[PDB]
Design a protein around this ligand. Structure first.
Ligand SMILES: NC(=O)c1ccc[n+]([C@@H]2O[C@H](COP(=O)([O-])OP(=O)(O)OC[C@H]3O[C@@H](n4cnc5c(N)ncnc54)[C@H](OP(=O)(O)O)[C@@H]3O)[C@@H](O)[C@H]2O)c1
Ligand SMILES: C[C@]12CC[C@H]3[C@@H](CCC4=CC(=O)CC[C@@]43C)[C@@H]1CC[C@@H]2O
Length: 322
């Protein structure tokens, strides 16, 4: 059943090539993630993407633990991802964060734990702490030291795999190039879609054996307001439409299947039963090379997530060409 297909990770673990995305806008109750994750699992999703940041880990864990108690899946059929938030980059905060997430999940490990952004922020009770205004408070933590703390999470059997998110090439190289590296990041999970296809990052990751995992592959939720206001809308792109018509597909399906054909692992968030069943048909067709080269033309280097809160940070990722 091709919908259960996985790509090899450099550490000998396997990751489903399509993942269920669980972030929703703050106004959306975390229970929807719960209801949506159950439905996604029934549909055949096995790879579930979350993060400390989405504050839905107790909800997703109930879902996953629901799907296990009724025979649907075994723990080892599920591939759960979570992410170290930037307020815990400090080595001594890394395990307790992940154990915190396990305690919430009521699971024994996560299959992938990754650094969410390379930009550390000031620890404490705010998720993104900001001053007497706007601006996040940066903290200065060496990414390699965060990395070592993550390697120790792997060694502890807490996370089967470890990786990063939103790193540029320079920042991957820093980890790669770490004197004494035990484990390489198995993936770099980054925004990826026809408007920001990531063709130089992707080539780089591959040459290094790192899996690129794409988020906002369907065009993001387009928040807040100002982005929704002027960002092009992926799923309505007239050329992605032409392509869906030609293959009798939907826009979403074209955009998902574009990523898979580049050996990207692609995430897809829907809390809509029907679009959940739809997204998993991505495996029911292919695009010829000539269609991939026409989608290539849509690239404009536009970002749905500039993560503005880390502008002026030492390690803000998006300044370099890639
Ligand atoms: N590493 C990171 O910093 C980071 C950042 C962003 C996202 N992510 C991960 O990536 C996942 C997905 O990315 P995302 O949140 O940017 O959203 P996305 O997958 O790009 O798309 C989300 C939007 O597309 C809609 N949609 C889903 N399927 C559809 C379908 N087949 N047809 C038409 N519309 C459809 C969803 O609507 P409905 O839900 O209403 O169906 C939702 O509004 C997230 O859930 C999160 O797990 C990680
Ligand atoms: C940009 C933002 C902070 C960063 C958030 C973003 C939406 C959800 C989100 C999911 C992630 O996985 C990374 C952080 C982000 C991208 C938030 C919406 C408005 C808020 O300012």
């Amino acid at each position: 059943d091709p919908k259960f297909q996985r790509v090899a990770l450099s550490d000998g673990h396997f990751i489903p090539v399509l993942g269920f995305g669980t972030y929703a806008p703050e106004e959306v109750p975390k229970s929807k993630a719960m209801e949506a994750t159950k439905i996604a699992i029934d549909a055949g999703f096995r790879h579930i993407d979350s993060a400390y940041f989405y504050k839905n880990e107790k909800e997703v864990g109930l879902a996953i633990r629901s799907k296990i108690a009724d025979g649907t899946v075994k723990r080892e059929d599920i591939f759960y991802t979570s992410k170290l938030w930037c307020t815990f980059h400090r080595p001594e905060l890394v395990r307790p964060s992940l154990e915190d997430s396990l305690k919430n999940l009521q699971l024994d490990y996560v299959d992938l734990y990754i650094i969410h952004f390379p930009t550390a922020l000031k620890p404490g009770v705010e998720i993104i702490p900001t001053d007497e205004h706007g601006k996040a408070i940066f903290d200065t933590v060496d990414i390699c030291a965060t990395w070592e703390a993550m390697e120790k999470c792997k060694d502890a059997g807490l996370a089967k795999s470890i990786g990063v998110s939103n790193f540029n090439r320079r920042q991957l190289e820093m980890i790669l190039n770490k004197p004494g590296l035990k484990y390489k990041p198995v993936c770099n999970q980054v925004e990826c879609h026809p408007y920001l296809n990531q063709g130089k990052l992707l080539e780089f990751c591959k040459s290094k054996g790192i899996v690129l995992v794409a988020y906002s592959a369907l065009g993001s939720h387009r928040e807040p307001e100002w982005v929704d206001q002027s960002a092009p809308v992926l799923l309505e792109d007239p050329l992605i439409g032409a392509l869906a018509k030609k293959h009798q597909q939907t826009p979403a399906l074209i955009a998902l299947r574009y990523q898979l054909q580049r050996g990207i692992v692609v995430l897809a968030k829907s809390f809509t039963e029907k679009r959940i069943k739809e997204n998993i048909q991505v495996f029911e067709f292919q695009l010829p090379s000539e269609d991939m080269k026409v989608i290539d033309s849509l690239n404009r280097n536009f970002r749905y997530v500039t993560a503005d809160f880390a502008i002026g940070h030492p390690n803000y990722p998006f300044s370099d060409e890639y």
